[PDB]
Design a protein around this ligand. Structure first.
Ligand SMILES: *[C@@H]1O[C@H](CO)[C@@H](O[C@@H]2O[C@H](CO)[C@@H](O[C@H]3O[C@H](CO)[C@@H](O)[C@H](O[C@@H]4O[C@H](CO)[C@@H](O)[C@H](O)[C@@H]4O)[C@@H]3O)[C@H](O)[C@H]2NC(C)=O)[C@H](O)[C@H]1NC(C)=O
Ligand SMILES: *[C@@H]1O[C@H](CO[C@@H]2O[C@@H](C)[C@@H](O)[C@@H](O)[C@@H]2O)[C@@H](O[C@@H]2O[C@H](CO)[C@@H](O)[C@H](O)[C@H]2NC(C)=O)[C@H](O)[C@H]1NC(C)=O
Ligand SMILES: *[C@@H]1O[C@H](CO)[C@@H](O)[C@H](O)[C@H]1NC(C)=O
Ligand SMILES: NCCCP(=O)(O)CC1CCCCC1
Lengths: 407, 403
């Protein structure tokens, strides 16, 4: 007998807001070679890739989604990258009975089963920062939390989820402030309302503006703890920006002691996963395929999620094991792949791969603290198993964390 | 005759509520198509409008578009897009198929972004088009200080956000900005407390009855107050919990409603040779049992915009159409430049675009005892306001003062 070709319709953002396809397309290519060379996964089938550059643009993606659906061969799965592209393809998908699997979507809105019924993602939702936040609050005994955000859909949705999570934990959100571009008024209000524990959600440019205003208002020190996303560039607060008044020394001072949460995208352990690679081996292998240096390559940090997305699908297709008879007008095979994807449980290069009821990836979070103008790993949190790995590396001026109020 | 294919995109099914817009405009569309074919305006060719049901759904609407490109004839342009989210999806992708789109009912301000939607045009003024009209009304009555009352829903916050830029560099102060999600009472009390006299309201029909209930309780009505609110509500909308009906009508008395003008009031012959009044009779006879739609005139003028655009494009090609696959970038640019030249008198008044946006007419109404009565119109082209003499009225000897 001969192996039947089975096709993935993928969209890779080679440019745009998140040019993640630069490192995610080779990672997918590597993962397909690895799955296809293993006779214990899909011995009857050969997994093939048909792809287009979405440019991280929904309009551009609409042209290629057509090209994927209205040209032979029939695709069994759709693989978009960006949240905007996934929102478009995961909503449209039901009309062609297609599973949608994203390797780079962070948007909390994509975890809506009503609207995105066949959607899965190896990239976790931005809401994954919230259980780690509630756990750090509980450990440090805070029940009164202030929240400051930049006006973006992603940050609004993340704070909406944090509200429902604090309520269950017996914690309350004291004050919620927002800003589009200028954070002068929201930070002044944080001082006025005497906020101590503050969750700040913004991009890098806005983070520099927040922290300049934080210096000027003495909103840093023993009394205050800032909670930020750990996605900023190496010495972000030192980066020259002519729009800000504050100096490097003044800014290194304002950021001192702040906590960050970051989604774990590469297993820190030296263990071997289903491909039998180590996290370090995957990085070395991917670097070789790349024309440019990892620093120059978009989506290098997300590349293990793209690799793991292929294995998740390969293992799901192996459970169902037929595939060549898939048609856009039939729910039968789709519902079977769905059930197999929903029951995913395996070790990947990014760590243990499991999806929640919404189809969103469950992962570890890396907790860090800025100690002397440098981030230091203070721990890791697993939302599913409720287990916190404590490093005993955290430091406070009082010798212990402060309090949420006046005392 | 060779066909000039046009992709008609709209909800048409009775199962979908917005299907009434698509069905309500088809007799008007039939009328313009019939005349253009009789007059042989597009000779040697003929206008071939193919209809595809979007069902007012993002997935169904996208598949309807995809199925039209795949199985349908080769369309030269898109006619339609009614529901805002479906229209945004199609409008953003247009360049991929070099298709120019003309909508007659999508009023979402979002679509005015030509960086995101360069191939999109609309004959209907957007929800923001009421703002340069309101500025003219404020200037006319010497209202230099205003308060705002907005429902925390995208449809309304878009309008309020636009008002900021319209009133900037103008001698008008927004002394109080108030928002609400479910109950306006707290926001209405704050407006009263800050002594707001002229209120610019942006909220739905359901919230409007709550707004006027709070207004009665806080005495924010009569000779001293002027409410300027949406003019698109259903007639007898207030009839449909704490306040009485008589107390609601007392607070509602004198409110100014603002919305686009469905048809021109000018008894002047249009591009078709008929006055707007003559077209309206023709539309009412043709519609039969199908319920009327306020977008009918915009759909009628829409067909004329396409016919005139195709004419100009045919001249441009002859100055130097059948094999237009969706690959011909040049023809798409020709159609795009031809549509930008649109300038004729239609049933909705003068049909002209400013960066894909309609420069049209805005209707002003006033609630008088039992219903909304027309009190004026704003011409966006000329940026002029005409207030109908012996219609608009104030409870006091003078219109209210702003402080
Ligand atoms: C996953 O990870 C590591 C990848 O480096 C793999 O470990 C390697 O596995 C080899 C077992 O297949 C192992 O074998 C070699 O070392 C043995 C002792 O030196 C030796 O006996 C083996 O020879 C075999 O025996 C006959 C003798 O006639 C040979 O002719 C054959 O070629 C046989 O291979 C090999 O020399 C190798 O040392 C080991 N290395 C480490 C660092 O663990 C592991 O297998 C991988 N798992 C998989 C692929 O499932
Ligand atoms: C797109 O059209 C605009 C506006 O054009 C005018 O209005 C039409 C309704 C019709 O009557 C046309 O013949 C008019 O010219 C163009 O912007 C104008 O450019 C001309 C220079 O050729 C200049 O007279 C005006 O100042 C401009 N008007 C405004 C309001 O800025 C524009 O050039 C056209 N763009 C194209 C074809 O790409
Ligand atoms: C693939 O499915 C077959 C069929 O039961 C099973 O024997 C095999 O172990 C599966 N492979 C993996 C890696 O789970
Ligand atoms: N870690 C990958 C995130 C990709 P996203 O969910 O599409 C959000 C991006 C896209 C636009 C610029 C920055 C945010």
């Amino acid at each position: 007998s001969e192996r039947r070709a089975v096709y993935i319709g993928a969209l890779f953002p080679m440019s745009g807001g998140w040019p993640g396809g630069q490192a995610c397309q080779p990672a997918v290519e590597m993962a397909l070679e690895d799955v296809n060379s293993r006779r214990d996964i899909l011995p009857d089938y050969e997994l093939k890739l048909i792809h287009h550059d979405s440019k991280c643009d929904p309009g551009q993606a609409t042209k290629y989604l057509y090209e994927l659906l209205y040209n032979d061969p029939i695709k069994i799965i759709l693989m978009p990258g960006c949240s905007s592209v996934s929102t478009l393809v995961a909503e449209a998908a039901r009309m062609w009975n297609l599973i949608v699997l994203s390797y780079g979507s962070s948007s909390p809105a994509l975890s809506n089963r009503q609207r995105f019924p066949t959607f899965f993602r190896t990239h976790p939702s931005a809401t994954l920062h919230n259980p780690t936040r509630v756990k750090l609050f509980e450990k440090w005994g805070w029940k009164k939390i202030a929240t400051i955000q930049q006006t973006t859909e992603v940050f609004t949705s993340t704070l909406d989820d944090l509200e429902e999570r604090v309520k269950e934990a017996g914690i309350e959100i004291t004050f919620r402030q927002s800003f589009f571009s200028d954070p002068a008024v929201p930070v002044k209000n944080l001082k006025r309302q005497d906020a101590r524990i503050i969750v700040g959600l913004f991009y890098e440019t806005e983070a520099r503006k927040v922290f300049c205003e934080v210096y000027k208002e003495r909103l840093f020190g023993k009394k205050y703890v800032w909670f930020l996303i750990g996605w900023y560039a190496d010495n972000w607060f030192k980066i020259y920006d002519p729009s800000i008044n504050c100096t490097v020394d003044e800014m290194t001072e304002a950021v001192e002691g702040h906590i960050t949460t970051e989604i774990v995208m590469l297993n820190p352990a030296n263990t071997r996963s289903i491909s039998n690679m180590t996290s370090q081996e995957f990085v070395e292998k991917l670097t070789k395929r790349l024309k440019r240096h990892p620093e120059e390559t978009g989506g290098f940090q997300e590349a293990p999620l793209a690799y793991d997305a292929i294995w998740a699908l390969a293992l799901a297709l192996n459970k169902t094991s037929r595939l060549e008879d898939f048609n856009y007008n039939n729910q039968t095979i789709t519902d079977q792949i769905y059930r197999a994807m929903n029951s995913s449980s395996f070790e990947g290069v990014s760590g243990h791969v499991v999806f929640d009821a919404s189809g969103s990836r469950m992962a570890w979070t890396l907790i860090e603290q800025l100690q002397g103008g440098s981030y230091k790993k203070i721990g890791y949190y697993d939302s599913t198993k409720d287990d916190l790995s404590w490093s005993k590396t955290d430091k406070w001026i009082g010798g212990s964390p402060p309090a949420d109020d006046y005392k | 005759s060779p066909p000039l294919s046009i992709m008609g995109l709209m909800p048409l099914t009775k199962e979908v509520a917005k299907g009434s817009i698509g069905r309500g405009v088809l007799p008007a569309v039939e009328l313009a198509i019939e005349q253009i074919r009789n007059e042989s305006l597009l000779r040697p060719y003929f206008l071939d409008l193919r209809l595809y049901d979007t069902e007012c759904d993002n997935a169904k609407g996208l598949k309807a578009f995809y199925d039209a490109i795949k199985y349908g004839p080769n369309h030269l342009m898109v006619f339609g897009g009614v529901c805002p989210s479906v229209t945004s999806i199609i409008a953003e992708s247009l360049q991929g198929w070099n298709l120019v789109q003309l909508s007659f009912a999508a009023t979402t301000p979002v679509l005015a972004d030509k960086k995101k939607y360069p191939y999109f045009f609309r004959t209907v003024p957007s929800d923001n088009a009421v703002n340069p009209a309101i500025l003219k009304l404020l200037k006319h009555y010497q209202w230099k200080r205003v308060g705002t009352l907005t429902q925390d829903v995208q449809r309304f916050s878009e309008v309020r956000n636009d008002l900021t830029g319209v009133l900037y560099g103008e001698d008008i102060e927004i002394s109080d900005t108030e928002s609400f999600s479910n109950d306006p009472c707290t926001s209405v009390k704050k407006l009263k407390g800050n002594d707001v006299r002229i209120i610019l309201g942006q909220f739905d029909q359901n919230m409007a009855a709550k707004v006027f209930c709070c207004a009665y309780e806080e005495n924010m009505y009569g000779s001293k107050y002027q409410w300027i609110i949406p003019g698109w509500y259903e007639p007898s909308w207030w009839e449909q919990s704490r306040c009485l009906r008589k107390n609601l009508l007392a607070a509602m008395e004198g409110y100014i409603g603002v919305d686009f003008e469905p048809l021109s009031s000018k008894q002047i012959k249009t591009i078709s040779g008929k006055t707007p009044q003559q077209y309206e009779r023709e539309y009412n006879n043709k519609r039969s049992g199908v319920g009327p739609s306020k977008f009918h005139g915009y759909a009628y003028d829409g067909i004329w915009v396409i016919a005139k655009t195709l004419q100009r494009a045919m001249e441009t090609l002859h100055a130097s159409i059948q094999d237009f696959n969706y690959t011909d970038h040049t023809l798409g640019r020709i159609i795009l430049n031809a549509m930008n030249e649109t300038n004729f008198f239609g049933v909705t008044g003068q049909v002209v675009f400013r960066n894909g946006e309609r420069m049209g007419t805005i209707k002003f109404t006033q609630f008088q005892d039992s219903r909304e009565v027309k009190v004026g119109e704003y011409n966006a082209v000329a940026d002029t306001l005409e207030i109908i003499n012996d219609t608009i009225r104030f409870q006091g000897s003078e219109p209210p003062k702003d402080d």
